[PDB]
Amino acid sequence: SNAMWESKFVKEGLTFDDVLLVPAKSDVLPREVSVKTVLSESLQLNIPLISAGMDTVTEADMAIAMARQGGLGIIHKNMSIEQQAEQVDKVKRSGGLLVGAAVGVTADAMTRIDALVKASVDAIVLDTAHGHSQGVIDKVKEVRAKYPSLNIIAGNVATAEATKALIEAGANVVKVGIGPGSICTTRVVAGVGVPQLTAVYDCATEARKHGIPVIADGGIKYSGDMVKALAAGAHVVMLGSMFAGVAESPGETEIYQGRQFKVYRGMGSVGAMEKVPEGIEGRVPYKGPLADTVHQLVGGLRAGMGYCGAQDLEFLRENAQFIRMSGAGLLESHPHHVQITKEAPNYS
Amino acid sequence: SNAMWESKFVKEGLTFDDVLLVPAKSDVLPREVSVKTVLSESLQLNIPLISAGMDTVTEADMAIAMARQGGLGIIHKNMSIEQQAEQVDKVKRSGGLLVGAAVGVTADAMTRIDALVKASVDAIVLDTAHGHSQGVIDKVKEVRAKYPSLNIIAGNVATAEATKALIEAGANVVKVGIGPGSICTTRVVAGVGVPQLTAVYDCATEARKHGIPVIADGGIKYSGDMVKALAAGAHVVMLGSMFAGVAESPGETEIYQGRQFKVYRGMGSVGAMELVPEGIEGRVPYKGPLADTVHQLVGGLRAGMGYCGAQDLEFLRENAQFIRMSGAGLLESHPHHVQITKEAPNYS
Amino acid sequence: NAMWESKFVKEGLTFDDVLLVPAKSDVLPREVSVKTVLSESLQLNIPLISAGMDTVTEADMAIAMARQGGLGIIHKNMSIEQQAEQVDKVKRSGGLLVGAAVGVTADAMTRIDALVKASVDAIVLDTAHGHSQGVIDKVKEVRAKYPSLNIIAGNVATAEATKALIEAGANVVKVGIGPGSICTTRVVAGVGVPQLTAVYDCATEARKHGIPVIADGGIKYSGDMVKALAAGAHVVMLGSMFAGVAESPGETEIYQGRQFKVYRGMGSVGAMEKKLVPEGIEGRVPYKGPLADTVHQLVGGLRAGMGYCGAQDLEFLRENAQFIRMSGAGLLESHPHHVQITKEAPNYS
Amino acid sequence: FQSNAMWESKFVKEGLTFDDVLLVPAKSDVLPREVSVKTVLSESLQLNIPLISAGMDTVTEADMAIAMARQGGLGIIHKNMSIEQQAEQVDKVKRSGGLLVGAAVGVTADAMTRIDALVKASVDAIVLDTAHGHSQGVIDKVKEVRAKYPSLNIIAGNVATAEATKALIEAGANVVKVGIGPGSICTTRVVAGVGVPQLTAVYDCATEARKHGIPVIADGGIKYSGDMVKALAAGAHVVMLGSMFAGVAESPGETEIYQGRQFKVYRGMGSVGAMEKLVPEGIEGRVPYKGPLADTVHQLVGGLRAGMGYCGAQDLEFLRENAQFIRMSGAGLLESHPHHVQITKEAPNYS
Ligand SMILES: CC(C)(NC(=O)Nc1ccc(Cl)cc1)c1cccc(C(=N)NO)c1
Ligand SMILES: CC(C)(NC(=O)Nc1ccc(Cl)cc1)c1cccc(C(=N)NO)c1
Ligand SMILES: CC(C)(NC(=O)Nc1ccc(Cl)cc1)c1cccc(C(=N)NO)c1
Ligand SMILES: CC(C)(NC(=O)Nc1ccc(Cl)cc1)c1cccc(C(=N)NO)c1
Ligand SMILES: O=c1[nH]cnc2c1ncn2[C@@H]1O[C@H](COP(=O)(O)O)[C@@H](O)[C@H]1O
Ligand SMILES: O=c1[nH]cnc2c1ncn2[C@@H]1O[C@H](COP(=O)(O)O)[C@@H](O)[C@H]1O
Ligand SMILES: O=c1[nH]cnc2c1ncn2[C@@H]1O[C@H](COP(=O)(O)O)[C@@H](O)[C@H]1O
Ligand SMILES: O=c1[nH]cnc2c1ncn2[C@@H]1O[C@H](COP(=O)(O)O)[C@@H](O)[C@H]1O
Ligand SMILES: [K+]
Ligand SMILES: [K+]
Ligand SMILES: [K+]
Ligand SMILES: [K+]
């Protein structure tokens, strides 16, 4: 019994800023690489980007623009059931685009899920703070029993054991991430978390055994961080802060120092729960149309995949190697000892 | 002999910001967890929080508010014997609440302890800069001889060897912490200390063999640090800076730069002593009623225990696993890359 | 399953992770030799090469570089006729050494012909990713036409890539993916190798063929150069430390009453016009005056480091110098600390 | 093969400095007031406190060496002087009550001429101070001084390795000074890339010197009194301080006022100003005025007594031979300092 006491401090975790991708032999160029991904037979994305289901990130206009760029948007749940079904319905009829919707694990959940399926949603995201809870496992079984063909994205988890549990309950996709969010204070106020790159790797190690894809959710600050998440085993990444400043996102621009900002807050923050916190309320710079951000993101992915000799995302997922570095290595990776004159489209 | 020379740099120590608690399978929700703890046959607490025995944190008005919230207050020793005996009696009169009192290891110590026992004190805290000194060990043995049933809290120590010595001397509770204090300069001016999370774990490993509880004293900056201290083996945590700003603490609010502050200083500082100092004098924001801080602290603990699947503190103490992370992991754990506009009640 | 389980096994070190250990020395800083040979046709008196960037090296910089005992690489953001004119302009000024960068494009061999006609000493087949077959194929195709031409191929960061370019016919391999001061490759693509590990891994392979490597990028102080040479590199390539000298492309600009020079990455938005995704940024460095003053501090720092290590020449430093690893607290100790600096030193700013 | 052994050991060694570690508290029966801080460097050189003021033109002259020795310590008169001035500075300290005093000598052709004038001024120890103590020029000078003066205390430095320590001992040095690059004003590790983290250097050099009965000096990098306790516990007999002494009243240079606060100039002996084209290995700076030396020494020795009590050391030999460290990360360092509290007043030992 003494084993659990002696294993308290054995595990080690890595995050994005701890590693770099090692360049390998390459026969492919960034322009000729493929960035398509399959989450299920009914759900395939042309770019591996999903906008997060938060009240400051994704509504009708964001989900529309995401799908038009080849990605996916998850309409948040901080609205009435009919309002969310009305948002899903807007995205589907506006050219047959893909759309998702967030649902919380509550007694009224199944009523909301039914209304979303009639709007022909492609996937429901049962997103909760702790996916390794029995309430979450049961809700996935109750939805899989009622809708055997519905794409179910279950999260959030950070361990292989939680990944195996949600897969066994009938979830097609597992969303990974406890604590990496830019607006998240879970690790500070509750002390609980797993470094995101290790969380993605540990969960992808289990999901591989079942043919299940995983979503790297939260913590991505630059386009290179997305490449690290995919190379660690993730099929797709979920972004919040990098999308909150975009024009097609809910909320209006506010002025700070002559510059435009958009509100970005955690769904566990005081403000978001009104209509103990595990998030903060803030603002991110205004970034303009989604196409300009998505173009820089995909372009960094194509560059990274060319460096790794990856013709497609599966090759990157199963062959790419990292190298660990210290804090001095992180300062070398960024621009240093030179006064930056202009703001770059991919570096702010 | 050469063994001690070659053993100089073998040990490694971890602090709160080096680790994260791994989320586990959970059948319980934060509202349904138990935060009760037993320190001795005569000492049972409803919340695992003790106010530190400093002239800037806890006097009668603070100890009353602590006990009423389910915790414990330690009346500080910077007083005459007659003043301290009356403070214990004031807290005792207000509904039969639990209260403790700090006593230093000096020739006059037993005279002060006698007056505290007549005021019906529940626990005596034998506070010294170095708990593994022979003068402290002798004082513990003689107080156990004169008062065989009196709760004796002995500290501070940081090693398994020091913990076993105070336990064999007759102390029911051992207080752990050398150098982690927010106002403490021991590790800077004397070079001596042990990282608090390693100190708590090393001492709890020894105290666990005897059924003795340990107190994680100092270094707690956020509610998540308290969850980590308890998951590392501590029954109860002792706070100073997180309590110095509340209304029920000695001293009155001062205005600095148009904002409200309360004085907070170390008991080894120049001001508190009026040897070389091992503390500094400082300032903390006014935080309002004690209940608001206690709610945020306990609420974060309930969240952590729910993330870890702990129904009570013994499950967290015996089963919770940590994961080590780098400074980049710490940067991910905090909010990042978002301009914070509002203050959260648990994150400032 | 090895490839999946080996994802996070490697560890990498950069300049600020290590220090050179002082060794027995009968050598004085003044008496060391800083000469190095890259090929039979390329001998440098100082192991310093100015980078081939449109804000770092043109004719006047290559002239001053060679006159100090080094080498300049004329950048490619110009016409073929302009670059051939820059090479000969440098060559006519006393028969000085000069190189020129050529990208892996359809016109590359057309540009290479014009450079060889100008009596260029080395072409740098410089690409963002040197381990692509387009680069290897281009090296053989250049090696076939010019058996006597010095070919510098980069950039790479692994032992496998060094062996690949050597098999294609490259005399010198340039090492560095992401360490540059103006570089965002590791930020926008997630790809890189810590430069000191990259140099060491490439030198381990390149020594097996007698091939020298160039430590390219990441050098902030003169001591970083000594660490790069002690890690296995024959010569180092500098950009930011040279962009502020008088002999460099661009004109001095005034910022806050002080004089500055533009310094930008060749993968930046501004340099690529001269919607694509950049791998560099546009910046500015303080104006530094004559090139001789910068080189004197650089060579002076190298001479001191070699004296501490007991290396009379650079080959001894390459084969004997020992490092010791340190933490961030060691880096804070290595720099000056707890003292407010009142005057700016020629080597520390 | 042999040629490849040096190539594969390039990145094997690891080094620790003061901010990487903490001293582990041990069983103790002694109190800080009751400990002994006496130390013996040789039979001719015994100090009551283990503190030496550095031989720099902004740290130690006659008035500093006088005040240092009177506190039980030692001052090293710097060498940026003529031979005649340095000998009279030594004589000034000797005439002021027969106090102990040292003098710095560089390894140059004039060295032996300079040393002679110092011995006639009755100096107690000469410091053969060089940027690189493991050079053959330094080894030769120690043998050449040991040949002429068999009883003279010779302090040779600076080194950072066990091999360099053993070489200087074999050349005839009674004391070895350890420190390459840790100085607060030092840029050696930045401009030349060379150094060893000071705590590992002290430990590695004391390991060798212990075998010959030779004491070592921890030179440079000490920012707080706890750094001194760590250096002594890492194997050093005595520590040499510069920045912590450069601000005291009895040190060369005058107090200058900036923004209402009093400052003194503090610069490295490898800075342009002190040597006044060339490549410097130091910078020029400024430190706050600290008042009389007695207040700084009192806080320093007091911090040592506290640490020795935490470690159960009755004297410095017990601390050098028994004290145990524990290693910590950057987060451990932030916990060690005061944190998350706005400091209102300055403590005598902290900032
Ligand atoms: C409501 C709140 C503040 N906290 C929790 O629900 N805590 C929590 C839930 C279950 C367990 Cl077992 C432990 C803790 C929240 C709201 C929205 C998002 C999150 C979030 N951290 N991730 O989605 C959290
Ligand atoms: C008085 C003072 C400044 N120092 C000591 O008493 N030092 C000390 C005592 C015994 C030994 Cl063997 C070694 C050192 C002090 C006062 C109040 C609290 C502390 C403190 N660091 N923790 O409680 C210290
Ligand atoms: C154009 C741009 C921005 N990026 C790339 O060409 N990317 C890239 C090329 C090939 C492969 Cl397989 C993968 C990525 C560039 C331009 C000029 C210089 C560089 C540079 N990093 N080193 O020379 C990069
Ligand atoms: C002159 C100068 C700038 N540099 C050297 O003399 N360098 C040096 C000497 C010998 C060898 Cl083998 C290698 C390097 C200097 C002056 C004063 C002090 C120092 C210093 N670093 N410690 O005392 C250095
Ligand atoms: O307040 C919250 N607490 C914890 N995590 C949150 C909260 N709100 C959103 N998140 C997570 O953070 C992700 C976005 O993180 P980001 O892309 O790094 O800003 C979301 O997709 C959610 O998974
Ligand atoms: O001045 C002192 N020097 C060293 N430690 C102190 C001093 N005063 C209080 N402490 C310790 O610091 C703890 C409070 O630390 P905090 O909760 O981080 O502010 C107290 O409970 C004591 O254990
Ligand atoms: O835009 C770019 N992106 C990435 N690397 C670059 C770029 N421009 C120049 N470099 C590299 O950076 C080196 C100079 O870096 P520096 O010495 O740190 O300033 C050059 O010699 C190139 O190898
Ligand atoms: O300019 C220099 N370069 C390198 N080290 C120096 C220089 N000047 C003084 N030192 C060293 O630094 C020590 C004092 O440094 P500090 O006590 O940390 O400020 C001296 O005793 C010398 O060993
Ligand atoms: K960089
Ligand atoms: K976070
Ligand atoms: K230094
Ligand atoms: K502290």
Side-chain angles (χ1 to χ4, degrees):
Chain A
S1 328
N2 226 310
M4 286 274 94
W5 180 265
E6 302 195 284
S7 63
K8 271 179 177 303
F9 300 99
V10 173
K11 293 194 220 181
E12 291 174 354
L14 298 169
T15 190
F16 300 113
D17 289 12
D18 286 318
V19 302
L20 292 169
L21 283 168
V22 186
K25 177 182 183 177
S26 176
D27 304 359
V28 76
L29 290 173
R31 66 177 182 85
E32 57 192 17
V33 188
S34 174
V35 295
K36 291 169 168 54
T37 33
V38 203
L39 293 178
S40 73
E41 301 296 330
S42 58
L43 195 45
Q44 61 188 345
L45 306 175
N46 289 325
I47 61 172
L49 294 109
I50 302 178
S51 64
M54 316 172 44
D55 65 350
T56 42
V57 183
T58 280
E59 278 187 22
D61 283 343
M62 177 65 127
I64 284 173
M66 280 307 292
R68 284 222 176 94
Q69 291 290 328
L72 179 61
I74 310 298
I75 301 170
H76 71 92
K77 65 188 179 63
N78 275 6
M79 56 183 23
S80 68
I81 301 185
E82 290 76 2
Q83 280 176 63
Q84 200 182 340
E86 294 170 348
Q87 298 261 309
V88 168
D89 182 65
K90 181 163 169 185
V91 183
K92 270 286 160 186
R93 89 170 28 86
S94 39
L97 301 169
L98 292 169
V99 69
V103 183
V105 182
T106 73
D108 178 88
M110 186 64 61
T111 310
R112 179 179 222 104
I113 295 172
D114 296 331
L116 292 172
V117 177
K118 177 170 190 294
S120 293
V121 67
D122 303 278
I124 59 163
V125 180
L126 289 178
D127 194 353
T128 188
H130 191 19
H132 210 181
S133 287
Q134 193 71 66
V136 182
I137 299 173
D138 291 342
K139 195 68 65 172
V140 175
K141 292 173 186 183
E142 298 168 346
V143 176
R144 182 53 69 206
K146 196 165 184 178
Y147 300 98
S149 291
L150 177 63
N151 291 98
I152 301 178
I153 302 173
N156 280 23
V157 302
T159 60
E161 298 78 4
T163 301
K164 168 203 171 67
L166 289 177
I167 291 175
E168 294 314 338
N172 320 93
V173 185
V174 176
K175 204 162 61 153
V176 178
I178 294 195
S182 64
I183 34 74
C184 170
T185 62
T186 290
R187 303 182 182 172
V188 177
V189 309
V192 169
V194 173
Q196 176 70 345
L197 208 69
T198 293
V200 167
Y201 179 68
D202 288 348
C203 294
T205 298
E206 185 77 346
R208 260 163 41 109
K209 303 173 190 295
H210 305 78
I212 295 302
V214 296
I215 305 183
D217 178 27
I220 289 80
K221 326 163 294 287
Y222 305 102
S223 62
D225 298 341
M226 171 195 18
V227 192
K228 294 171 183 174
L230 298 176
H235 272 70
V236 92
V237 304
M238 182 176 266
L239 304 187
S241 65
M242 297 206 62
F243 284 159
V246 151
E248 299 90 335
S249 62
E252 290 184 357
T253 62
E254 74 183 23
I255 282 271
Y256 167 58
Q257 289 193 12
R259 293 175 65 196
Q260 285 181 304
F261 283 75
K262 276 192 153 309
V263 171
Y264 179 55
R265 62 185 185 184
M267 292 289 284
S269 60
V270 176
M273 294 308 301
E274 295 177 278
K275 266 85 204 162
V276 209
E278 294 193 11
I280 50 86
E281 311 186 50
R283 52 177 181 201
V284 294
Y286 179 75
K287 273 165 71 165
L290 178 72
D292 301 331
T293 302
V294 170
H295 186 72
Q296 297 298 319
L297 286 171
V298 174
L301 178 54
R302 293 186 178 276
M305 297 181 66
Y307 279 114
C308 297
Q311 187 284 135
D312 59 78
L313 284 180
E314 177 196 298
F315 188 100
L316 188 79
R317 226 176 295 116
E318 326 268 329
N319 298 95
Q321 302 288 289
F322 296 81
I323 179 168
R324 286 168 289 121
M325 63 180 179
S326 67
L330 177 63
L331 288 155
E332 185 188 63
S333 305
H334 285 255
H336 52 89
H337 296 278
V338 168
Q339 190 177 150
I340 307 187
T341 286
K342 296 171 186 177
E343 190 141 3
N346 46 12
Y347 191 76
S348 69
Chain B
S1 181
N2 215 70
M4 285 274 155
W5 180 264
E6 303 194 325
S7 192
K8 271 177 178 303
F9 300 101
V10 201
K11 292 194 194 180
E12 290 174 24
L14 299 171
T15 190
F16 302 117
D17 291 344
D18 287 317
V19 304
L20 294 171
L21 283 167
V22 185
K25 173 62 180 59
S26 177
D27 207 350
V28 75
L29 289 99
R31 64 178 181 84
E32 304 164 339
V33 285
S34 175
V35 294
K36 294 169 195 307
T37 36
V38 201
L39 293 180
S40 74
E41 310 176 342
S42 30
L43 196 46
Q44 305 194 116
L45 308 177
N46 288 286
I47 62 172
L49 294 170
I50 302 179
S51 181
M54 319 172 46
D55 66 356
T56 3
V57 182
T58 170
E59 277 185 20
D61 285 344
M62 175 67 128
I64 285 173
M66 279 308 291
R68 287 191 179 169
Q69 291 288 329
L72 180 62
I74 308 296
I75 304 294
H76 70 91
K77 67 188 181 63
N78 276 5
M79 271 182 298
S80 69
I81 300 186
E82 296 81 2
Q83 282 174 296
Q84 198 184 340
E86 184 60 33
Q87 299 261 311
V88 169
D89 184 10
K90 179 165 168 186
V91 183
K92 280 257 117 143
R93 296 190 286 263
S94 300
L97 303 170
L98 294 169
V99 68
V103 183
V105 183
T106 169
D108 64 79
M110 186 64 61
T111 310
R112 182 178 224 103
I113 295 172
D114 297 333
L116 292 172
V117 175
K118 175 169 187 177
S120 296
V121 67
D122 302 270
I124 294 295
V125 181
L126 289 179
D127 273 343
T128 312
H130 190 21
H132 209 184
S133 74
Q134 194 70 66
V136 180
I137 297 174
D138 292 343
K139 197 69 65 173
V140 173
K141 291 173 75 174
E142 65 175 289
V143 176
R144 180 54 70 206
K146 197 164 184 177
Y147 298 98
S149 292
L150 177 62
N151 291 312
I152 303 178
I153 299 175
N156 277 24
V157 304
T159 60
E161 189 176 357
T163 301
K164 174 199 173 178
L166 289 177
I167 292 175
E168 290 178 319
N172 321 94
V173 186
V174 177
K175 203 162 60 153
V176 180
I178 296 195
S182 62
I183 36 64
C184 168
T185 61
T186 292
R187 303 182 184 172
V188 178
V189 308
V192 170
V194 173
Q196 175 69 347
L197 206 69
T198 288
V200 167
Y201 180 68
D202 287 351
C203 294
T205 297
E206 189 78 88
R208 229 166 49 98
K209 300 172 187 175
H210 305 261
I212 293 302
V214 292
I215 305 182
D217 179 23
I220 292 176
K221 327 163 295 287
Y222 306 103
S223 62
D225 298 342
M226 172 193 18
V227 189
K228 294 172 183 176
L230 299 175
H235 269 68
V236 92
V237 305
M238 182 176 267
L239 303 187
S241 65
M242 297 206 62
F243 283 157
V246 309
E248 300 90 337
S249 60
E252 287 189 356
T253 322
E254 166 174 14
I255 207 100
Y256 163 57
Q257 190 169 29
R259 286 172 61 194
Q260 290 178 92
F261 286 78
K262 279 192 90 168
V263 168
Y264 178 53
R265 63 185 185 185
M267 292 290 284
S269 58
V270 174
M273 298 278 78
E274 294 178 325
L275 308 83
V276 315
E278 294 192 11
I280 52 148
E281 310 186 50
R283 195 156 47 198
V284 294
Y286 176 74
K287 274 164 71 164
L290 178 72
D292 299 329
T293 304
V294 171
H295 182 256
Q296 297 300 132
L297 285 173
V298 173
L301 175 56
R302 296 185 183 275
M305 295 176 62
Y307 277 115
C308 297
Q311 284 176 153
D312 55 17
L313 285 180
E314 179 195 74
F315 188 101
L316 187 79
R317 224 177 294 119
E318 302 279 49
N319 297 273
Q321 304 290 290
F322 295 80
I323 180 166
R324 285 168 287 121
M325 64 179 180
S326 68
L330 177 65
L331 289 185
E332 185 188 64
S333 302
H334 286 252
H336 51 87
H337 296 278
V338 159
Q339 190 174 96
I340 312 187
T341 63
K342 178 159 256 289
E343 184 224 2
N346 48 12
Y347 192 76
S348 68
Chain C
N1 218 353
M3 287 273 92
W4 179 263
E5 304 193 326
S6 66
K7 271 180 178 304
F8 303 101
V9 298
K10 290 193 192 298
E11 296 175 0
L13 299 170
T14 189
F15 302 112
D16 291 77
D17 287 318
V18 302
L19 294 170
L20 284 167
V21 185
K24 58 180 65 174
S25 175
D26 65 58
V27 210
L28 291 99
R30 186 171 180 176
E31 59 188 16
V32 280
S33 173
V34 294
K35 297 166 197 171
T36 158
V37 203
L38 293 316
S39 75
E40 348 176 330
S41 59
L42 194 45
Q43 305 195 25
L44 309 176
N45 287 325
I46 63 171
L48 294 171
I49 300 177
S50 66
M53 317 171 44
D54 65 353
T55 43
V56 183
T57 276
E58 277 188 22
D60 285 343
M61 176 65 127
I63 286 173
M65 275 318 274
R67 285 192 179 169
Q68 292 290 331
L71 179 62
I73 310 297
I74 304 294
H75 70 92
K76 69 184 303 240
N77 273 5
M78 57 182 22
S79 308
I80 303 185
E81 297 298 328
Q82 282 178 258
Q83 198 184 45
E85 185 215 70
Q86 294 261 309
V87 169
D88 184 65
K89 206 274 184 181
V90 181
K91 281 293 282 216
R92 295 187 286 113
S93 300
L96 300 170
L97 294 169
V98 68
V102 183
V104 184
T105 76
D107 183 86
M109 288 247 59
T110 310
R111 174 179 279 111
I112 295 171
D113 296 332
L115 294 173
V116 175
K117 293 166 183 185
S119 295
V120 70
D121 303 73
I123 41 164
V124 180
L125 289 178
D126 195 354
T127 176
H129 191 21
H131 208 182
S132 76
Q133 192 124 18
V135 181
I136 296 175
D137 291 342
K138 200 68 127 227
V139 173
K140 323 174 185 183
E141 177 184 5
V142 176
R143 187 55 153 204
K145 197 123 95 61
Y146 300 98
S148 65
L149 175 62
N150 289 311
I151 303 177
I152 301 175
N155 279 23
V156 304
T158 62
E160 300 81 7
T162 298
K163 172 199 173 177
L165 289 176
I166 292 176
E167 289 173 298
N171 322 94
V172 185
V173 177
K174 204 163 61 153
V175 182
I177 295 195
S181 64
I182 35 64
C183 168
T184 62
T185 292
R186 303 182 183 172
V187 179
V188 308
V191 170
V193 171
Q195 177 70 347
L196 205 69
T197 290
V199 169
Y200 182 68
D201 287 349
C202 294
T204 296
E205 186 77 344
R207 281 191 336 154
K208 301 172 189 175
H209 304 79
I211 291 301
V213 294
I214 305 183
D216 179 25
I219 293 177
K220 329 163 214 74
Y221 307 98
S222 61
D224 298 340
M225 172 194 21
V226 191
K227 295 172 183 174
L229 297 175
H234 277 64
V235 60
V236 306
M237 184 178 269
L238 301 186
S240 68
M241 299 206 62
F242 282 156
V245 301
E247 304 89 335
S248 61
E251 187 64 29
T252 80
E253 180 171 17
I254 53 136
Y255 171 60
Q256 283 188 6
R258 264 175 63 85
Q259 288 178 313
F260 285 75
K261 275 191 153 308
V262 168
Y263 178 54
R264 62 187 200 195
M266 293 290 283
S268 59
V269 174
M272 295 173 61
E273 192 64 24
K274 183 64 171 53
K275 184 174 176 64
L276 281 144
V277 165
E279 293 192 10
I281 49 87
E282 311 184 49
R284 52 182 177 207
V285 295
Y287 178 75
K288 245 167 157 181
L291 178 72
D293 301 329
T294 305
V295 171
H296 183 71
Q297 295 297 319
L298 288 173
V299 173
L302 176 55
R303 293 185 178 276
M306 295 178 63
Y308 277 111
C309 298
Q312 190 284 138
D313 57 90
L314 284 180
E315 179 194 7
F316 184 100
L317 188 102
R318 225 176 294 116
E319 301 280 6
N320 297 94
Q322 302 291 289
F323 298 81
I324 181 167
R325 286 170 289 121
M326 64 178 179
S327 66
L331 176 64
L332 292 184
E333 186 189 64
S334 302
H335 287 254
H337 52 88
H338 294 278
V339 169
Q340 189 176 97
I341 312 186
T342 58
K343 292 176 182 179
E344 272 186 13
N347 46 14
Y348 191 74
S349 68
Chain D
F1 299 105
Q2 183 181 22
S3 311
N4 299 77
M6 284 271 153
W7 182 266
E8 302 196 327
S9 65
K10 266 179 174 40
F11 302 101
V12 164
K13 295 190 89 138
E14 289 172 352
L16 299 171
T17 189
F18 301 111
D19 287 12
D20 286 316
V21 303
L22 294 169
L23 283 168
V24 185
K27 181 67 179 60
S28 176
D29 67 17
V30 76
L31 290 174
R33 69 179 184 84
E34 307 164 341
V35 289
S36 173
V37 293
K38 295 170 308 264
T39 161
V40 178
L41 295 179
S42 75
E43 286 294 330
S44 315
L45 196 46
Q46 305 195 24
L47 308 176
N48 289 326
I49 62 171
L51 295 170
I52 301 179
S53 65
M56 320 174 46
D57 62 354
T58 45
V59 183
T60 300
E61 276 188 21
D63 284 342
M64 177 66 126
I66 285 172
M68 280 297 282
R70 285 188 179 166
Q71 290 291 335
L74 178 62
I76 308 296
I77 304 295
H78 68 265
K79 69 188 183 119
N80 273 5
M81 270 180 227
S82 67
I83 301 185
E84 296 78 2
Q85 281 175 324
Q86 202 184 344
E88 291 185 349
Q89 292 261 309
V90 169
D91 181 65
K92 183 163 169 185
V93 183
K94 275 287 160 186
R95 293 185 282 112
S96 300
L99 300 169
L100 292 169
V101 70
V105 183
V107 183
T108 77
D110 67 13
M112 187 61 59
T113 310
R114 180 180 283 274
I115 295 171
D116 297 332
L118 293 171
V119 175
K120 289 170 181 186
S122 199
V123 68
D124 303 286
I126 52 101
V127 180
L128 289 178
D129 194 353
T130 28
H132 192 21
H134 207 180
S135 75
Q136 193 70 64
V138 180
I139 296 296
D140 291 341
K141 197 68 64 173
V142 176
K143 291 177 183 185
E144 177 184 5
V145 176
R146 182 53 69 206
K148 196 164 185 177
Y149 301 98
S151 346
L152 176 62
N153 289 312
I154 302 178
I155 300 174
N158 276 23
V159 304
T161 62
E163 299 79 5
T165 301
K166 174 200 175 67
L168 289 177
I169 293 175
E170 292 177 320
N174 321 94
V175 186
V176 175
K177 203 161 59 153
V178 178
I180 296 282
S184 63
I185 34 66
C186 168
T187 61
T188 291
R189 304 182 184 173
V190 178
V191 307
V194 170
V196 172
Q198 172 68 343
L199 206 69
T200 286
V202 168
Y203 182 69
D204 288 350
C205 295
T207 299
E208 184 76 28
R210 231 165 53 102
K211 300 173 188 175
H212 303 78
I214 293 302
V216 292
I217 305 183
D219 180 26
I222 292 177
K223 327 163 294 287
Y224 305 98
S225 61
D227 298 341
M228 172 195 19
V229 191
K230 295 173 182 176
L232 298 177
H237 272 70
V238 94
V239 307
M240 182 179 269
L241 304 186
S243 65
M244 297 205 61
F245 284 154
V248 309
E250 299 89 335
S251 62
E254 290 186 358
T255 68
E256 303 178 354
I257 181 134
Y258 169 56
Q259 282 193 11
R261 297 175 66 87
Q262 287 177 125
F263 286 77
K264 276 193 154 181
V265 169
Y266 178 54
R267 62 184 184 185
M269 295 291 284
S271 60
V272 175
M275 295 172 49
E276 195 157 348
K277 309 208 280 206
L278 73 321
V279 175
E281 295 191 11
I283 52 148
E284 310 187 49
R286 198 158 48 196
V287 294
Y289 175 73
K290 275 165 72 163
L293 175 71
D295 300 332
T296 304
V297 169
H298 183 72
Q299 297 299 313
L300 286 170
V301 174
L304 177 56
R305 295 184 181 276
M308 294 179 62
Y310 277 113
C311 298
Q314 159 65 34
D315 58 319
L316 283 180
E317 178 196 7
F318 187 102
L319 187 79
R320 283 193 312 274
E321 302 280 7
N322 296 274
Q324 304 291 290
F325 297 80
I326 182 166
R327 287 157 41 212
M328 64 181 181
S329 66
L333 174 64
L334 290 188
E335 186 191 65
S336 303
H337 286 254
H339 54 272
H340 294 72
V341 155
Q342 192 176 98
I343 310 187
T344 72
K345 60 191 69 173
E346 269 190 12
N349 47 13
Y350 190 74
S351 179

